[PDB]
Design a protein around this ligand. Sequence first.
Ligand code: MG
Ligand code: MG
Ligand code: MG
Ligand code: MG
Ligand code: MG
Ligand code: MG
Ligand code: MG
Ligand code: MG
Ligand code: MG
Ligand code: MG
Ligand code: MG
Lengths: 82, 149, 186, 129, 151
Amino acid sequence: PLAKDLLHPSPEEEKRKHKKKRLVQSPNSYFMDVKCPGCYKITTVFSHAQTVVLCVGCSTVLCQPTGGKARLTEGCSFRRKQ
Amino acid sequence: GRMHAPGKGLSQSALPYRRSVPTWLKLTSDDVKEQIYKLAKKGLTPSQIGVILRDSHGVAQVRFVTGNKILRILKSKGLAPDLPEDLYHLIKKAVAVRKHLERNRKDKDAKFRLILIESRIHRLARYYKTKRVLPPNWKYESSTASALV
Amino acid sequence: IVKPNGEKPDEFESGISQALLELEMNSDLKAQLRELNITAAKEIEVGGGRKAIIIFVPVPQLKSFQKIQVRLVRELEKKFSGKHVVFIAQRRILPKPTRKSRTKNKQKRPRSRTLTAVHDAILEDLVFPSEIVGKRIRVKLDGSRLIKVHLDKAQQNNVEHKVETFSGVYKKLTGKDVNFEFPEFQ
Amino acid sequence: VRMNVLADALKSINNAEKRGKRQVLIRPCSKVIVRFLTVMMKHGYIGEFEIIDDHRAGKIVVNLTGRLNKCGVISPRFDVQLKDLEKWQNNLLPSRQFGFIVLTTSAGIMDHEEARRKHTGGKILGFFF
Amino acid sequence: ADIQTERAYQKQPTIFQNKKRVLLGETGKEKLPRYYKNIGLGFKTPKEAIEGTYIDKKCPFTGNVSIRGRILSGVVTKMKMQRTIVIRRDYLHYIRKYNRFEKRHKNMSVHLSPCFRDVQIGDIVTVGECRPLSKTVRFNVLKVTKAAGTK
RNA sequence: UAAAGUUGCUGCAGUUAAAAAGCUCGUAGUUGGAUCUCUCUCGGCCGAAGCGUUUACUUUGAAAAAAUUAGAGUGUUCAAAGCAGGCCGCCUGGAUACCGCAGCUAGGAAUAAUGGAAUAGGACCGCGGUUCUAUUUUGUUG
Ligand SMILES: [Mg+2]
Ligand SMILES: [Mg+2]
Ligand SMILES: [Mg+2]
Ligand SMILES: [Mg+2]
Ligand SMILES: [Mg+2]
Ligand SMILES: [Mg+2]
Ligand SMILES: [Mg+2]
Ligand SMILES: [Mg+2]
Ligand SMILES: [Mg+2]
Ligand SMILES: [Mg+2]
Ligand SMILES: [Mg+2]
């Protein structure tokens, strides 16, 4: 305590903190590139998706809504964007 | 804290610092606008439009891409709700609780919650009157509440 | 090429216009700069014996410029030798409304045409290849300020050597001291 | 709900100084807050501070030197004339040798001594000593 | 708009309306000349008063009244009387023991001329002091400014 | 009246000493988050004209009975007082301040309200139109 630099927070404890309580608020979510097991072409998906994302180029269900992060279908791969 | 509940929760979205469109986003402002228009024709409120665009089409903030908010976009072209969506949802909730109450006369929690919902409706309606969104003679009536929704 | 608002082109503006024309003659991106139209240019001393070039691109054509900004900058760097080139949109700062004024404005001043907003946009365009990750204003003991800008590291090198060029440009056209640094991570 | 951000800032810095901490973060920030912190600067009571630009409202990280006994706000912001300034500083300040009353006049934000020099009254904001 | 609705004949006293006219100059009616005056203090005469036909002896522009003394402003609160309205003036009264103000108001019945049409509950009126026009009316509406959100 | 910070604006108290409504909603009231750095015409470069949304606030200026209060001068023998007095016919006073609030006045523009374009019921340039109208015409008349 006492002499603790609030100007230069450490990255680990900055991620440790709540998203709204950081020096500058940074959301915890991200955008994923989801690849279906059979379809050759990728889809952009929100991590905390609240809707049943359907394959635009097929009938496969890509993710299911949950309390927090959306659950990807088994086999459907994903890569973090940016 | 909550307006009508004792709870004091801290749960909301945290928009990022960067207001620039991400490079991977290949959608143009016009494409986003047409997607918004057809989603509105499907019968969705601006909230649902934003959720669908964020979930499936990979746009973070429509205002961030098109330089303009969703409701303004809908009102600009013409197809916008007669009364604001939050007021509409409040009226719908009040109608539902009233319908439940008229048959369950013994329910006293429902009466209390209904009064809370009416207070919220009145506050919102008075605010919208002061901003000229609603006509000054617009008033909430239980008899015509179901008609409005 | 240059179309000044005051319709008084000068020697450096003419040089910039003929250089852009030469690009339109011998660079595949000709079809871009045939439509585009810059408005002003200036050469200003920046570091010791060094100088820098500022091109006042029009606001509505800013994004079209930023589409091929990197190519334009590299080509002008080759043509102008060691002369750094920065593209900054030309924005009008309407005067602040004052009780001792007149009919100069029958409409409220838009927030985009304000000193603070104009300066923020000027900095953003000044560091276009990078992104403004953060901003920190430090107030010194003498009352002076210092705007320290956190830029993305993704595109460091590209403007890493261009450090102290943006600072000089901003000190010239804005009058405020600005320092640039790259955060370790986000 | 939160009103008079200046009161919250002054309470935060006062509590941090009572606790012996070397830096304090204040949020939200404001131009009134920055001017008050600067008049506290020029008299050596606070130290260097830095503004963090969150796009909603900035934060201020304030370095603290142990020279600050009290800093507070006076609400409501009463209008003070030149005649009543003596009564106000008799009430608020601990001595005539040190301490300052801060006020907004049309000339800006400044301590009571500068307001006397410029012959301008205004509205009281707070005090520090 | 018929202007003869009283038992007596309504007419501007200064204007003479029975000047002899030859048949050669009988192109319909003579377009009865209108009496109007320019009240000072930089107040413009409404075009309605100049080109109107109403008879109002209390009108500051076409009647027999002199604007003198105090010029005040108020908000229109009621318009339920004939040719006169009730405006509200709000202010803060200082209390020295507490160094604090309290909100006060007083209503004022002011004569409103037919030259000011489309006056709504809520607009601002600049009124000017005149001689007593009734038991409670001592002011005449000189200018009307619309509310902040009018159509 | 002070003591009485035992009426508390300054500046009091409400767990147990007297004290927070049984609980919630809710009109009025009170309070309310960041944010925005004077000119075109008239008269002799100025004097004029608006109006910059309006203020609140702050500073100045004017108008504000005397007595009383503060206060300058003056040995009532001193003093409370008084407006007198001093020099060898002259000389010299009978000042000044203060006077809430509201109302006038002119600077300042931080603070605090308020507005200015989103059915464009927008600004500026020129255009064109529609209508009515004052006088130019013109030694004169006409
Ligand atoms: Mg509540
Ligand atoms: Mg007593
Ligand atoms: Mg005492
Ligand atoms: Mg007690
Ligand atoms: Mg008890
Ligand atoms: Mg209780
Ligand atoms: Mg209330
Ligand atoms: Mg505020
Ligand atoms: Mg007196
Ligand atoms: Mg005396
Ligand atoms: Mg006065």
